[PDB]
């Protein structure tokens, strides 16, 4: 019935207090699934490639480059962080691979290409580098390319900078192969993939008087198929669907997805735990999924007044919201992702737990990404969390959970049953049992 | 000969007028000759009316061109800048190079004072050092400019009735002879009368006070009135403080602050102003607005061509 998940690989340092530069901040598969790129808080993007021999090969290091460097905002005297927020792959145009990497202020387009030949030959200098006699040049010679060991080169092709006042939190590529959007806390800009000196501001929710702000943009994404539909969520728990056909400026929303709040759960933190940290479109495009702090909501695009399905990621932390507020654990921005057939959704949790919900069977599994079972092809044992006391046999007590071990970033293989789970420092890859 | 260098300096000026940096050798020669000219320059330079007084520019070259459009072009219009030619600007190098070239070519027409932001310590932090490193790849030009910055006059006097300076008065300063007695051929100190003259600010609080900038002192109306009565000064010009309307009166028309950078830091959206002194010492302020430029990537709500 359920999918048997087996430990496959682990990447990163082993049992060390890692500095705040090797912490993985984004994980993303490419469109065909054979490339897996991870970014960290140091601005260092690492790309893994699947081995070629279903495809159940391993992932090995393929390329490494420094995406963003530390920078200083001379205009305001603030340090600009080099942390990589989002990484988005582009559809394969040719033998090279392209991706968009963004820090808080700048989006960069990087090209990854393989070079396997080197020019050999010269007319005025020996191959070593010594300068030959200038009077020995009697016949001209043209350099001839020679095969060499394959090497992978990554270079930046275009820089999209100096356009966002606030911190960029989302980038999404349009389905027309031409444009993409970048959304900061208050504005959404539409870019052209080959034009960097101008951008089109389609959405602007910044009030003229800013001392009555009530919400900010937290996520944004284009429709996977439609070229005119995109959504963006707010900190108040509402998702606005904008149609770009109606008008040039999308300041008015075509649809508004929100759930009325019952005063039963009208607690002090009811405004924080209702903020949406991630919005994801299903692969079919007929469904949309949002993640707040405590739950995962799946929305039907034809129904606006309530979601069709709601899953509780971790209910045991509802009664401990006050404790999580003290140590700033209530402000975490978790993410979520669909599987290939839009039937299973996986999202992260605390204590190195990631949850998986099956839409067809309404079944829940909790798994642990830990090094204690570092044996390949080993079935992960499902985990169950119990309240304070009644620890039965394998029940993990709530008070024993480690809130410093958060799984914020997860990815799914677009076609296979391979998931990448990023802990604080390590990157875990799990595969289906075959 | 002097004539060939005169045409060379002129051609440098027209080249700079369209935002074109000079070569390292050209910058070296210009800085050397400016140092030669400024060596005999007094601490309190006598400026003769008429003259147009300008405030901070902070590297906004296009706003400097707008200022020249509003107030006229040198040497037709006599100018008097009050420091802060660099930092927090996209074209600090071009701005300071053009100003130094104008000073060398027209030493009797344009007078440039010294502010807090032209120093080795400040320029290393606020981007001028980074700007010259990114545009040249070496610190030689930075060294030339920072060496030249030491020779800039601290203050200026206009007909012995108007006193122009960047920061403001100092607790240790009571007479113009005290300023004339100082040694300005040095790096900006963290304390002392020289530091206060480039870091002080006016305030409504009586007497003196502490400045939140990290240096200098804040003086009240009583201090300004006492200084005016002691030195016989009708007015005290000032700069270094951002004002929204361009020029701001304070201390009962004894201290006036002039800011000449419209849209300060490309985000404040403020107005700039310049004070024009008539032949009869009749002050008159001309406010202007930022020059219309497309800008670094133009975020517009008008549909661009690629989307149209």
């Amino acid at each position: 019935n359920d999918i048997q998940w087996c430990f496959s690989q682990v990447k990163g340092a082993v049992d060390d207090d890692v500095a705040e530069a090797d912490i993985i901040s984004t994980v993303e598969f490419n469109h065909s699934g054979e490339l897996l790129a991870t970014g960290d808080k140091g601005g260092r993007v690492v790309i893994f490639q699947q081995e070629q021999e279903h495809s159940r090969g391993e992932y090995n290091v393929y390329s490494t480059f420094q995406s963003h460097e530390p920078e200083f905002d001379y205009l305001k005297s603030l340090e600009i962080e080099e942390k990589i927020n989002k990484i988005r792959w582009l559809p394969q145009k040719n033998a090279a691979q392209f991706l968009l990497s963004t820090n808080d202020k700048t989006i960069k387009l990087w090209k990854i290409s393989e070079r396997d030949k080197r020019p050999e030959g010269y007319n005025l200098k020996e191959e070593d580098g010594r300068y030959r006699d200038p009077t020995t040049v009697t016949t001209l010679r043209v350099p001839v390319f020679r095969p060499m060991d394959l090497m992978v080169e990554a270079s930046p092709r275009r820089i999209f900078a100096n356009a966002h006042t606030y911190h960029i939190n989302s980038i999404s590529i349009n389905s027309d192969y031409e444009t993409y959007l970048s959304a900061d806390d208050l504005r959404i800009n539409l870019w052209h993939l080959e034009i960097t000196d101008r951008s089109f501001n389609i959405v602007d929710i910044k009030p003229a008087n800013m001392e009555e702000l009530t919400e900010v943009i937290t996520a944004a994404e284009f429709h996977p198929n439609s070229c005119n539909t995109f959504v963006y969520s707010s900190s108040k728990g509402t998702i606005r669907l904008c149609d770009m056909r109606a008008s040039a400026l999308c300041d008015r929303h075509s649809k508004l997805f929100e759930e009325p709040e019952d005063p039963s759960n009208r607690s002090f933190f009811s405004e924080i735990i209702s903020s949406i940290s991630d919005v994801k479109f299903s692969h079919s495009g007929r469904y949309m999924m949002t993640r707040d702090y405590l739950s995962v909501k799946i929305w039907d695009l034809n129904m606006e007044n309530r979601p069709v399905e709601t899953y509780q990621v971790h209910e045991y932390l509802r009664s401990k919201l006050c404790s999580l507020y003290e140590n700033d654990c209530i402000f975490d921005k978790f993410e979520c992702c669909w599987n290939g057939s839009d039937s299973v959704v996986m999202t992260g949790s605390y204590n190195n737990f990631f949850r998986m919900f099956d839409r067809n069977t309404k079944r829940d599994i909790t798994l642990e990404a830990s090094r204690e079972n570092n044996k390949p092809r080993t079935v992960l044992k499902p985990r169950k969390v119990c309240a304070s006391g009644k620890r039965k046999k394998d029940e993990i007590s709530v008070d024993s959970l480690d809130f410093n071990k958060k799984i914020l970033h997860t990815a799914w293989h677009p076609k296979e049953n391979i998931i990448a789970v990023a802990t604080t420092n390590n990157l875990y890859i799990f595969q289906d049992k075959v | 000969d002097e004539k060939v260098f005169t045409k060379e300096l002129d051609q440098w000026i027209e080249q700079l007028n369209e935002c074109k940096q000079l070569s390292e050798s050209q910058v070296k020669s210009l800085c050397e000759k400016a140092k030669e000219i400024l060596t005999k320059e007094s601490n309190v330079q006598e400026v003769r009316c008429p003259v147009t007084v300008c405030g901070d520019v902070h590297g906004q070259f296009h706003d400097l061109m707008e200022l020249f459009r509003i107030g006229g072009k040198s040497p037709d219009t006599n100018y008097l800048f009050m420091g802060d030619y660099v930092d927090r600007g996209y074209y600090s190098v071009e701005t300071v190079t053009l100003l130094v070239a104008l000073k060398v070519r027209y030493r009797e027409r344009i007078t440039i004072l010294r502010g807090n932001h032209e120093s080795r310590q400040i320029t290393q932090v606020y981007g001028f050092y980074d700007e010259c490193l990114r545009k040249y790849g070496n610190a030689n030009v930075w060294k030339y400019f920072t060496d030249l910055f030491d020779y800039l006059p601290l203050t200026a006097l206009v007909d012995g009735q108007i006193f122009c300076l960047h920061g403001g008065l100092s607790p240790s300063i009571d007479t113009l002879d005290h300023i004339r007695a100082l040694d300005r051929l040095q790096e900006v100190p963290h304390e002392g009368p020289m530091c206060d003259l480039l870091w002080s600010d006016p305030d409504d609080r009586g007497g003196w006070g502490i400045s939140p900038r990290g240096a200098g002192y804040t003086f009240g109306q009583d201090i300004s009135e006492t200084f005016n009565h002691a030195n016989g000064l009708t007015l005290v010009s000032r700069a270094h403080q951002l004002v929204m309307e361009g020029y701001n009166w304070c201390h009962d028309r004894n201290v006036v602050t002039i800011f000449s950078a419209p849209n300060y830091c490309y985000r404040c959206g403020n107005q700039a102003a310049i004070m024009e002194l008539d032949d009869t010492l009749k002050y008159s302020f001309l406010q202007f607005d930022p020059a219309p430029r497309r800008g670094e990537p133009h975020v517009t709500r008008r549909t661009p061509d690629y989307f149209l």
């Binding site: 702000l213 919400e215 002090f268 405004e271 924080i272 | -």
Partner: peptide, 21 residues
């Protein structure tokens, strides 16, 4: 009286003090 999201207050305060000297 629920408290506001941290991003809202951070944006508000950062944009408020844009004339610091």
């Amino acid at each position: 009286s629920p408290l506001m999201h941290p991003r809202v207050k951070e944006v508000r305060t950062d944009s408020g003090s844009l004339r610091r000297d």
